[PDB]
Design a protein around this ligand. Sequence first.
Ligand SMILES: CCNC(=O)Nc1cc(-c2nc(C(F)(F)F)cs2)c(-c2cncc(-c3n[nH]c(=O)o3)c2)cn1
Length: 193
Amino acid sequence: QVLEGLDAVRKRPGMYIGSTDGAGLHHLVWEIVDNAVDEALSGFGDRIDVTINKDGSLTVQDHGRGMPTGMHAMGIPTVEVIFTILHAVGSSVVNALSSWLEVEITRDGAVYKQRFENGGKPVTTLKKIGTALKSKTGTKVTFMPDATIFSTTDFKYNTISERLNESAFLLKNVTLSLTDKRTDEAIEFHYEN
Ligand SMILES: CCNC(=O)Nc1cc(-c2nc(C(F)(F)F)cs2)c(-c2cncc(-c3n[nH]c(=O)o3)c2)cn1
């Protein structure tokens, strides 16, 4: 296993997301959503909320365990390693192809945040920004796709809606929501089994 930096993704995006058109743009959404879905499949969290923001960014929020908030080697947060090392993997690929990305983790009565810019360069460490009830847990990722890479940066509500509907059907007993702040459109999916 040869590890790589995020430059490898930026120099050959098609290798990681297939293309740099709308299909590729939406692959970024699928990668982050799949991380939330994997967590829910393991039994942590029963709702996943996706928001298309007015500024063109996209947020995915789950109510799972929260990404690990501890340290790797050299005092580097585990979350930084997940988002900045390519193990050629979704999180790092999305970060590499975003002009900015924020990850917010809630667990153990604390809310933590790390911000990356310009293809996944950290501009903060993982810092405690607030507190929450001990019962509150989860991960929220917001990213702005890099307009220098993609030929389109317009997320398509219908495309995402269809995917989340399908994901809700495969998961069972988990609510998937989509909200578009550009148009105010909103929908929720939930399939009981
Ligand atoms: C919005 C995107 N949503 C997202 O990305 N949510 C998300 C991601 C993760 C990842 N964690 C990892 C890695 F590598 F740190 F394990 C990769 S994704 C985990 C997670 C996975 N395994 C173990 C734990 C854990 N907490 N405590 C404990 O004992 O185990 C947590 C949970 N929620």
